[model samples]
Target: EPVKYGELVVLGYRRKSRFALYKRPKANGVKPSTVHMISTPQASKAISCKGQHSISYTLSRNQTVVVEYTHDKDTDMFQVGRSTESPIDFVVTDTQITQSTISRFACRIVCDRNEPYTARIFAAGFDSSKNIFLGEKAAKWKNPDGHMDGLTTNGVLVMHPRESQPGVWREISVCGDVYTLRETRSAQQRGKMVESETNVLQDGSLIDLCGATLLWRTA
Candidate 1:
């Protein structure tokens, strides 16, 4: 198939070809195939290097949060949100970053004390060390069948929190009980490898995955 636009001509495959017209113009006055609009001018900052930036979600003002980036020879990038208070770390980019193909790097979040907390990602870009902060919501288990089947990583990890004793809660995996912990600055996992299939949690147990210690606390 073939297509034409003014002075330019597009050659398509023998089978068929489809294309999306851009709403904005490009170089040589030729419009691109697509266009994206940023929400605010202040949200369009680009990151050239790696560093740590402490950020608070406007919606969840009481929660503690931070954003960090890593730039190695690979030039590959990702984000994670972690809590300065608890061991419940989450790969925020795994579920939120739209540019991610697979959950490579995750946004870290420390499951806020005694309650489920939400972290917001604004204009958060993927494949590059840049992003935007849009909003925040409770880090939840994607539920199917419209059923609250407990806090399970619907697709990422089958996990939930357990009240160890009284006002304390710990994380547990529904499947093979294992978690990888990493340092927010270097994006390195640490701790010893321990596998469990029971409901009991090894509180204060540390596993070093890639140099980061996975900490566990009992209620």
Candidate 2:
């Protein structure tokens, strides 16, 4: 028996004739995704994010840690975004569109191709050049211990419904750090990191990316 990790479905198009299409944005360049899971961003001085996903945060006083994501043999990743380049597995368009608020490289969902098919989510998908950089302008922080994390431009929101009632919304950071909603949306400041919760997507979890919402179900 082949069991899937989880299923992700868009929420808005839940009716008859649910065929909505977007002009598949154009792009000529395609870059690779994260490759090296360096212990620290400072490990690499190269600015080429071609295959390195880095989130910079102050390490010392003048230190910039580009926490490049490395590949994991245990899990498989699926990215969702607006661009049709080649990276995005799912392309989301204007939710009807007066204007599209959807983040072109919104977020990513990673599932355990290894065991139980466990799934987790993170804000901001890796770019075409295979890098997921939050840059210096983004809201990022680092612990004295050298750990670092940051936020996306808009943010990837998630909620877990209690069969009893709707759940509260929370934001997931680039490193999967769970946090309360930011001061305002993408405010330069980030919300308090929540240690009590997790980025794990349970059955019936809701994933929102500003312009669109998705329901996540696990089998």
Candidate 3:
């Protein structure tokens, strides 16, 4: 069996959060690194020309900006979703109502292969094509310095609960940017970037995927 990094526990599922552990990727391959993302605009006609690991944000019918990701040897990636697909490492479902608010490919967690074994979460997950797609209507924007970023349909919200006080909830973005909650849950307008906050998950950090919440536990 492969070595495990950590786990994400489903909050309110049982007496305690039902835990789901992620294992380390044990394959021999290339060497490189990052939480680093690179962007480029490719021809709209060639929709299948996405990278081995990348995200494409559709700005318009004719304009799509694709961000290619570097293969980081130091990190292992895990995906969470509602689908029964093989790509999703952790499968989550809404327990109450018929109408589901969770995205099929909701979010992802990247854990460091070495050192602290730190785990960080991002807003969206890759589909079967190994690509993440943000549709035109999805809340997206270019930074002042000009890199691409976006928000999913419902949104991925997180709160870091403290020992003494209530944790402040915030939104996480497609490219792993943290921000304040949008005016409405499904608002087209993206939230303000909370520069002081980060995407790193502490032991008690709670990740809310609209209808489902997962409590992160360090290994």
Candidate 4:
């Protein structure tokens, strides 16, 4: 495909993915192919996305809670690094920036040059009042079917305040088991099929480490 506007194209996959060649717009144009395969943004078989996963401790009105929250708080980071190359870290680039909403934020950690890299996020915060477990609902979604692993990479993680109005605080770190991580595949691997890195996979591509789910409050 030459990459049209509305055409359903295979863009790329993250990790543990069964298929490649994901669909995205190249130059941007309407296409006749309406056969769209609806699926979670970067969250698919190959990649595990935690859109909303966080722990919130409410603070008093006069007081506020400021924390340097990390999605990996729930997940442990293996800190895996190879001599060949390390994962490329990028900033969160969610066009839907204004309002607080759980969106797909992706960045490349390691570019395999042949496959998509790992990416993670905590998205349950978009609603503001919701807690991490609220986002975990994805785990129960579709139930026992077990198509997407339970609370694993495929599960979405969000945060909720352990305390609704816990007095004043400068900055505290609420750690969890969820670790922030993502994998990336270089453009070289896609060959001719990949029109570009963004569509298929590329090195140093940005990943959405955090989202509306995580926030800092200052009084």
Candidate 5:
């Protein structure tokens, strides 16, 4: 529901009254938080490349290939159900049984202590603007033997693939299209709150809207 406010400073006759107001300040520009994501026992040392299509990467026995990307909350923010299809789609492994050693999959990434963290497995087809499969909203899958399997291309972009997101990869998936097959493993973790009393910014400015009462907006 939207918040509504009553008329302010109303008076009879001449109505010599006014209401105090404060303009919304421009948000301070900060670098896209750095995220050091890693792969679990399932997948490791997987070759990741910057490209427009999904290609297959074979892993050595018990190898854990990990990939890392810079995250920007402002640009990469996304909402759930923006699209039925997933933006992060790809093929991790193929049908070749000879590709036996590579079956499990996992994802881990370091995120800003003060910001939320999200990860996705993408599936890029022969073209960059496509998808194949996607995962649930950061679901938990058991890896008793320690592994997940499928097919996927591990690419993250914000311009194509309906409902594309930027900067942060906040909400994403790993399956949609079926070009080069791939399975994706993904997870998420919330960031620590940016409390005003502690961990003050260098400029000593408190974060806006964080446990902060809007004095101007107060009744």
Candidate 6:
């Protein structure tokens, strides 16, 4: 393991990796905290390009850990996660990867010590005028493995595909912005992508997540 915490140790090998959360020796001292194994997708199934691919976990108070993994041959880019208080946003670059005899994967994890809270794998990003796909949210941000998709020609706009509803896409909105939504063909005038009747989104706009899925907002 490259890094170690007071009570936790992370281990990395060729195709697998795990972490051990140590506790005080038991009365017998024979068996201590066991190692917890982790894997991508937690199985051998291949991840679909169009499917919602992300993970979610809830951390305990006063507990911390960091888990690193080797990247799969076909892996690149990530839909970074975000927290209500501390927002995480970035893109993984090739320079951040470790290329050596033991090629480590670009996925680096950091279980920071803090109050108990839950985090999502696909962190959300809000740009001034577009929804950006900032890479993973952790103590350290590492470059992704494969190619980049879900971005627009401008590169700032993130095209979030909505499987529940086909042909339509969604994006997070920036604060103090007024968006007008339209169903069919619409034209983009100013930098913002125009919308419907009219939805004014504030700092942390998350209406789609609250039950209104058809509403589209932009920066």
- TM-score to native of every candidate shown: 0.19, 0.75, 0.83, 0.18, 0.18, 0.17
Predicted structure with the largest lDDT when compared to the true one: 3
Can you write out model 3's per-residue Cα lDDT over 1-219, one digit (the tens) per residue? 255566788876712356555455552111212223323355443343334566777766656666666566677778888876777877888745468888888998887776677888999887776667888789888766567788998899999986467788899997778999988889988889898889999998999998899988887
Q: How many backbone clashes does candidate 3 have?
A: 0
Candidate 3: regions farther than 4 A off: 1-3, 14-17, 22-46, 163-165
* Cα shift from native, residue 117, model 6 (Å): 36
Write the number of the candidate with greater lDDT, choosing between 1 and 6: 1
Clashes of each: 34, 6, 0, 63, 49, 15
Q: Write the per-residue lDDT of candidate 6 for residues 36-65, one digit (tens) a residue.
A: 222343232222212122221112222222
Task: Report the lDDT tens digits of candidate 1 across residue range 161-211.
Answer: 332543222232211123332223122222222343332223333222221
**Candidate 5, lDDT over the whole model:** 0.22
Q: Which whole-number lDDT from 0 to 100 does residue 23 have in model 1? A: 17
- Residue 36 accuracy (lDDT) in model 5: 22
List lDDT for all candidates, in order: 0.24, 0.68, 0.75, 0.21, 0.22, 0.22
Over the stretch 96-201, how does candidate 4's per-residue lDDT look in tens digits? 5564222222211111111222222222221221122212222222123322211212322222233367422111001212322222211111112111112121
Residue 7 error for model 6, in Å?
Answer: 44
- Residue 8 CA error for candidate 6 (Å)? 39
Evaluation by TM-score, superior candidate among 4 and 6: 4
Q: Which segments of model 6 are wrong by more than 4 Å? A: 1-58, 65-67, 78-219
How far is each candidate from the true structure, as Cα RMSD in Å? Answer: 21.5, 7.4, 4.7, 22.0, 21.6, 21.4
Ranking by lDDT: 3, 2, 1, 5, 6, 4
